[PDB]
Amino acid sequence: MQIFVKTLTGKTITLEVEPSDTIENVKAKIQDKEGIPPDQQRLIFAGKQLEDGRTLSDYNIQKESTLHLVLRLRGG
Amino acid sequence: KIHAYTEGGKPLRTIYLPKLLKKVFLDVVKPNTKKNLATCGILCGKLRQNAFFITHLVIPLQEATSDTCGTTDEASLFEFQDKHNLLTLGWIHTHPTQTCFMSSVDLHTHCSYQLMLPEAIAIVMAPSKNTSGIFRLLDPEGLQTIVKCRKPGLFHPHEGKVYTMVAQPGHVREINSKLQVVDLRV
Ligand SMILES: [Zn+2]
Ligand SMILES: [Zn+2]
């Protein structure tokens, strides 16, 4: 099924996923498609930040749901 | 009158940067700078008629050392930006005692911002030198180097030129526009 990931930059990323996919699977898909490593990604759905070992179905993310991506910031 | 292009020939839209922002940032993080601690902030704003305007300098919840800084509560930052319909246009941070340049870590960070917005900028303030600089990765070549990178080590180098300063007149233009500073710290 398709979900959307909306950034804070006016971009929407489309992903192909299954309900059984984990959040870390989803972040890997973002890296594969968009080039952002998983450790920089924070995903938010329904006001809450998503945790790596849970599944999309654990948060009731379904066909055409929109998640939000906010990046960490590191200077070093 | 002035149009900028990436290395691969893609159009870059103008970012209007308030003249006061650099100074105001330094003032607002000065306490840290004094304790030899780094600080970072987010450059936030709006798109109007094919140009971006920086309107908000947002200081997120963070942790720091004399040579690193990082966010610790990006959900609070998302909530603020979402509620106020503010775009992420780039970021700024201090090198309290070092020169003005982009570190390996800095490039790994900026790459992701610049992947999400081609115009994204990284402002580095070097107060002990009274220098500063506005940087971006080379596009596509610098972005490609960092996306494919799998080297460990906080300080690993990269093969080739990776980044550049924004040009003058540029895609970044410094204008006398107003600014709001939002401090999300305790
Ligand atoms: Zn730096
Ligand atoms: Zn690297």
From Swiss-Prot, chain A:
Exists either covalently attached to another protein, or free (unanchored). When covalently bound, it is conjugated to target proteins via an isopeptide bond either as a monomer (monoubiquitin), a polymer linked via different Lys residues of the ubiquitin (polyubiquitin chains) or a linear polymer linked via the initiator Met of the ubiquitin (linear polyubiquitin chains). Phosphorylated ubiquitin specifically binds and activates parkin (PRKN), triggering mitophagy. Phosphorylation does not affect E1-mediated E2 charging of ubiquitin but affects discharging of E2 enzymes to form polyubiquitin chains. It also affects deubiquitination by deubiquitinase enzymes such as USP30. Disulfide bonds: none annotated. This is Ubiquitin. It is a peripheral membrane protein. It is found in: Cytoplasm; Nucleus; Mitochondrion outer membrane. Residues 1-76 form the Ubiquitin-like domain. It comes from Homo sapiens (Human). The chain holds residues 77 to 152 of 685 of the full protein.
UniProtKB/Swiss-Prot annotation, chain B:
A motif (JAMM motif) lies at residues 93-106. Coiled coil: none annotated. Zn(2+) 2 binds at residues 108, 149, 156, 158. Belongs to the peptidase M67C family. It is found in: Cytoplasm; Endosome. The record marks 38 as: Indirect zinc-binding. Residues 14-144 form the MPN domain. It comes from Schizosaccharomyces pombe (strain 972 / ATCC 24843). It comes from the Eukaryota. Zn(2+) 1 binds at residues 93, 95, 106. Zinc metalloprotease that specifically cleaves 'Lys-63'-linked polyubiquitin chains. Does not cleave 'Lys-48'-linked polyubiquitin chains. Plays a role in the multivesicular body (MVB) sorting pathway. Required for ubiquitin-dependent sorting of proteins into the endosome and subsequent trafficking to the vacuole. May regulate MVB sorting through deubiquitination of ubiquitinated ESCRT proteins. The JAMM motif is essential for the protease activity. This is AMSH-like protease sst2.
